[PDB]
Symmetry: D2
Subunit: 225 residues, 4 copies
């Protein structure tokens, strides 16, 4: 219980959102390894299912506690634990669609469990587009830049994301994030990168829309000396 | 009760939102003239006040039923009444801040009253910026383009907005809106303009954050023959 | 010769540019009415023809001297004559393509003729897109906002443009312009609108790519009192 | 003379451009190591000096031949040699300024020298801004994503850049590039990253504006297995 964290943790999730006027509630459970930056998550749509839009857009909404950090970069995210941190993100798609997501991350040390509460709002996805037609096929791996805001004790993230399409194409989406520990820390990182890789597999049956998500994420500094 | 509307109506409002992590609830009452495109509104912060951000950002969230339309353009908004219409908008500020707002408009014909329920979410306003420092001084009058989407029976709005600043400057914000009647109509307008003019005056006292808002709005076609 | 201008003038044009690596030179002649805001132009491709891209993208590059101004708004553009004015514009298309155009406008009072010299550079139009496939069908009429920059004696223009497509669709393009009289004037306008309407008709034959362009443009203040 | 390249090469440069209406010509000479991804360049302003804008904006305009590539990623850039390749880029600054740059790269095998011819156009830098006030202090190291366009035999680059400011701040700029070998190759890379690090030092004296630029660049695949 280095910051209330252990090598293998469980996670519980609850998301509320509204995309193109369609409301929904999703819940989930997962297992992850904070220090390896690995997590695996099972989501279940609990209101408003089946969703009229691609599962893939919600992927990056479901915890930088799961990142592998080298000893030589401050780990703003694990240091914020157990109380945790919150984040706000805008997604700007190349076709004018816009999302905002908000999440709150917290640890129960007694349960060795992370609680994740999020809100997802999306507007202006064209009904004819790959998201509303569910023609998407996961995000490509990426490199996000993490930038400290020193006067404020918060971080920014900047990653240009690509949602791959079933027809072989790709849809660009700009993520701009604000990461805020619940207690603004005296120790702050220098700017660094975090690389990410997602997998997503639908496991929906007759009763329920359900899928499986994984992330693998590793922080690092510039490769140039 | 042409569409359940009369020449002078009252309006009730309830807004829930969250800007840079700060939650709030606002309620309001107003009086307006649908056919003149004129409205006047009094807002009161009922949770989360005083607000940490400029009142001005919420202005365009508080009803295209209040627009003066010439006989020769279909009035998508009055035609949707009494049931009403919903809209979704993204605000993209020049400094990277992003909002989304959602509203639902409906008429009680028996009460001669419009009900307005909205949600406002904003992220990434810099703490040092004019919005979070409350250094803004109303929006400049504008011309919004309204564009029909014929296969779908909905409209888009496109207006480039300018929030004026107390120091003499201006902050650009791009509004992209989707307007959706609750029943998709057979009669749709051609593209047209709507011009808008807002006024805003804070009337906050010791007990309550409160302000007064007005809009005047007129639709028209191109000025070129 | 109010500013070296008369009610009906001729115009000569020369444009050099490069779009997606393809270089070209266009020359033209026209006739216009400065005080009515009306002009008609004939262009001829003189190097690099036939063009691999839609004629329509060059339309707004070919003179705010041709705008109808009411007496109650300063006419920054006619006041700059005969010496004239220069302008710089960025075009940002919704699909990531980007152009820049630069023009220089000047009067020969002796010839009652406006000289127009411009540069047009475009990058990143997808080869598969409506511009490079020549699938476009004129711009929709628009309303540009003109904004004074008082410390500097220059104007900005902001117009959200829509290039119509032969298949019934539309392509958004954001124009941001800087208008600079060659002598920064003591008399500056307040912000106002200019509305525009273009027509374009190809008149290409066997020897030469050629087309005809017209503009009609009228300035005005807000329609709200 | 693997593709006409050797381990250490000289480079000659000529740039023509225009930023906010100010024209200029720059020439340069350098020495670099193609296989190490290292180059060092000396620039001299030969017309239009001293420049009214920060040297730093021209930095990324002055050759992906200088990138360290692992054996397991196709090197589109060295493979295009000696004939070479061309590229087109848009720069979109957070404050609305816009640039376009075009370059042509070619090898003289007999002289063991790379020739670099470029064009740089910038508009809408505010006179009051850090670029026009020369208040900038180099770009931060970055990670660019290189994306193949398989039907066309060209690459795209996407990098979100940060120009550091003398006052401790930062200015965001989005680079979107198109890389085109003069002969479209049968061998194309998969998407990968290139990381970059620039240094810039002014060496201007009484006669001439002059500076020294270096780049170090290394390609790599995702760090996630």
């Amino acid at each position: 219980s280095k910051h209330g964290l252990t090598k293998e943790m469980t996670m519980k999730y609850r998301m509320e959102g509204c995309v193109d006027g369609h409301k929904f509630v999703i819940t989930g459970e997962g297992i992850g390894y904070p220090f390896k930056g690995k997590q695996a998550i099972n989501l279940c749509v609990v209101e408003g299912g089946p969703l009229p839009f691609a599962e893939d857009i919600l992927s990056a909404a479901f915890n930088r506690v799961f990142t592998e950090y080298p000893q030589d970069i401050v780990d703003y995210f694990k240091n914020s634990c157990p109380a945790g941190y919150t984040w706000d993100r805008s997604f700007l798609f190349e076709d004018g669609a816009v999302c905002i997501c908000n999440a709150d991350i917290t640890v129960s040390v007694e349960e060795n469990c992370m609680y994740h509460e999020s809100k997802f709002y999306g507007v202006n996805f064209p009904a004819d587009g790959p998201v509303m037609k569910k023609m998407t096929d996961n995000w490509e791996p990426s490199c996000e830049k993490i930038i400290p805001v020193p006067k404020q004790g918060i971080l920014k993230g900047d990653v240009s994301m690509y949602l791959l399409l079933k027809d072989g194409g790709r849809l660009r989406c700009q993520f701009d994030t604000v990461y805020k520990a619940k207690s603004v820390p005296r120790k702050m990182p220098d700017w660094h990168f975090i690389q990410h890789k997602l997998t997503r597999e639908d496991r929906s049956d007759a009763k329920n829309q359900k899928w499986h998500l994984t992330e693998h994420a590793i922080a690092s500094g510039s490769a140039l000396p």
